[PDB]
Ligand binder design. Structure first.
Ligand SMILES: *NP(=O)(O)OC[C@H]1O[C@@H](n2cnc3c(N)ncnc32)[C@H](O)[C@@H]1O
Ligand SMILES: [Mg+2]
Ligand SMILES: [Mg+2]
Ligand SMILES: [Zn+2]
Lengths: 7, 345
């Protein structure tokens, strides 16, 4: 979780 | 000065004593005699009763009764009779009571609130319906996409008959079928430049449940700092459910305060940079409804707490991951930095 999230 | 036993109290024998209560405030009482006396005390308050009226009928020493009453009170197992008074939100009222809150005042704060759902996909679907059925008074839905068949794995308000229709219009229909006492409005908008955020209305909080481009979150963050607008982000990184941060102007850190999440989706070498950009443009998350739904659920919880004020949101100053392929919950620290280039002083 060291990159951005999708949703 | 009348107290009543909350309906959310339960009692069991366990180990060398007993249990009183359930959830975060469950207490193990090893001392059997004390456990028995707590039960006798609790029983006095099934109907609204004063301390003295209960002490009259309890038939245990006042020293013991006083101890038991303090114990029940400090866990919100007994609550003011005032706070317990048909009601579609009645199960939520038990939840608020269990934190020592007056459930009618919480409900009033939710009723008076306005929330923006920015992105009406997996996360947006699940957050919106929780908020609608919890009685958030005004919900603004923002998206510009149409429903596709692949969306039905996560996007719970959509049916097969809805494929091809606009997401905002179907969410609105489904929310009002579930709670016709609230207000829902739609905005057809794709934020593809920073400046489009000027088209998003002020609200009590934004739910940021949109994910294109990769730096939308950076845009939203900067805009919300500048506009004094609270927001919460949620979603997933493949199989990890993520929620937070919950950004509150002048109080919590922003997305850029601490430098934990990657922000260069690229390379200093142009040749390599173009390869990276292609791979990341082709990126499709490995979505899984359980991951989606966890993130959405805990995001909605923090919105209800932020507005309702009865308990502190988990994601203040934190971006929280919940793993789905192992047992793990981990927080990235996003506390305020006095040196944040975005939100500092
Ligand atoms: N995570 P997913 O299930 O793909 O849902 C995301 C929703 O958010 C919409 N969306 C994505 N980026 C934007 C922007 N920049 N503006 C407005 N809406 C956006 C997607 O259409 C999807 O429904
Ligand atoms: Mg998508
Ligand atoms: Mg789509
Ligand atoms: Zn900051």
């Amino acid at each position: 979780m060291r990159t951005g999230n999708a949703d | 000065m009348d107290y009543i036993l909350g309906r959310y109290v339960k009692i069991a024998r366990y180990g060398s004593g007993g249990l009183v209560g359930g959830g975060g405030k469950e207490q193990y009482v090893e001392n059997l005699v004390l456990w028995e006396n707590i039960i006798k005390t609790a029983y006095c308050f099934i109907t609204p009763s004063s301390y003295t009226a209960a002490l009259e009928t309890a038939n245990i020493p006042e020293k013991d009764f006083s101890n038991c009453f303090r114990f029940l009170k400090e866990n919100f197992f007994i609550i003011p009779s005032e706070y317990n008074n048909n009601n579609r939100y009645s199960r939520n009222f038990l939840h608020y009571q269990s934190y020592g809150a007056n459930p009618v005042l919480v409900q009033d704060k939710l009723k008076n609130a306005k929330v923006v759902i920015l992105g009406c996909g997996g996360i947006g679907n699940h957050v919106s319906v929780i908020l609608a059925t919890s009685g958030i008074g005004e919900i603004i839905l923002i998206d510009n996409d149409q429903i596709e068949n692949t969306n039905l794995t996560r996007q719970v308000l959509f049916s097969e008959d809805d494929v091809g229709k606009n997401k905002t219009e179907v969410i609105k229909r489904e929310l009002l079928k579930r709670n016709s006492e609230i207000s829902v409005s739609e905005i057809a908008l794709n934020i593809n430049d920073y400046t489009d955020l000027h088209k998003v209305p002020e609200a009590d909080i934004w739910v940021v449940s949109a994910d294109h481009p990769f730096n939308l979150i950076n845009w939203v963050n900067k805009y919300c700092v500048r506009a004094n607008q609270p927001y919460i982000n949620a979603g997933y990184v493949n199989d990890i459910a993520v929620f937070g941060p919950l950004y509150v102007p002048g109080k919590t850190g922003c997305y850029e305060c601490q430098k934990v999440v990657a922000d260069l989706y690229g390379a200093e070498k142009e040749n390599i940079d173009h390869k990276i950009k292609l791979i990341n443009s082709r990126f499709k998350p490995a979505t899984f409804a359980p991951v989606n739904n966890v993130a959405a659920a805990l995001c909605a919880a923090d919105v209800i707490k932020f507005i309702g004020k009865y308990s502190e949101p988990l994601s203040l100053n934190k971006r929280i991951g919940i793993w789905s392929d192992e047992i793990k919950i981990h927080s990235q620290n996003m506390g305020r930095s006095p040196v944040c280039s975005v939100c500092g002083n």
